[PDB]
Design a protein around this nucleic acid. Structure first.
Lengths: 66, 66, 65, 66, 66, 73
RNA sequence: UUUUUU
């Protein structure tokens, strides 16, 4: 399925993303890990466990070919 | 049924859509694929993985008949 | 059950509806079609595929039984 | 279970309710019926079909009990 | 182990007052008369509110629990 | 004899790490609001956040982001 | 707690 193949690609290849949340904030960093309900997004120093339901859209810094 | 016939129609025939997010923002693009939970939009060589729970409306640019 | 009978009553009597979305905005059209998760709303040649999870209220122009 | 015992008690007895929506709007009326996902709310000629995921609070006109 | 129902049941049967915070920014203070899987009945005087759990962001008790 | 399987549950593993090592977290709510505290407990739908005297039963569906005070592992 | 009630 699309979601987890897209996400793993961004994980293994360490592509940097912008993550827009439904409340309106945004954050960037690298998807270190993810499960069914959360994404762990690290930005060098800082970690953010992010709930998928709060994510609006993930936008990669470089083109993902699957 | 309806939802997947409609998205596939927009994907096969490469019709451009406006997607309206539940937090007021909006995006233009082409549906390049989709699963249960997400829609992969594309415009200007840029990609947006978009969670369906964040979409309120999809408005095709051209009339779709099923 | 209540929702499909209500939705379908509006599909086949071609009753116009206002559709209030959870986020404040508001549409208006005819229910062309629907399924578990979406509603196909048409006004003229404009189609809106609308996610139910994003729908607050559906208010018909007429009365429904 | 509480939700449907409560809703159906207000349906039969014809107790007026205020309905507070997640978006901050508020309807007032009578629950003519309901299923697992919506509430059919009526006051006069006016007929609101309301999605439960959109409702925050229902507030009766009169104490309800069992 | 069920954190939610044990916490809510403790509030219910020791009649602790709570402040219930809604995702839309409203708030409401009362006692938990009752709850099932989707809703909470919050009573204050002869006022009753059926609250949908999907609209609650937080419950803050005015006493301490255990 | 070997044990059986997993899988990777990232959510529980990260929360339980925060809970037992008493790492202060900042919690962002989907309505924009935020709060601080220590995870005392959690289940499928809720997290118990204690800060001093205050206890908060926060619903997960209302949580946007959890930022810990220290790096996790 | 990822597309119609935690």
């Amino acid at each position: 399925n699309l979601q987890d193949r897209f996400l793993n690609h961004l994980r293994v290849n360490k592509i940097e993303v912008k993550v827009y949340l439904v409340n309106g904030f945004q954050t960037k960093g690298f998807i270190r890990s993810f499960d069914s309900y959360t994404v762990l997004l690290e930005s060098g120093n800082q970690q953010s466990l992010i709930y998928k339901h709060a994510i609006s859209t993930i936008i990669p810094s470089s083109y993902v070919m699957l």
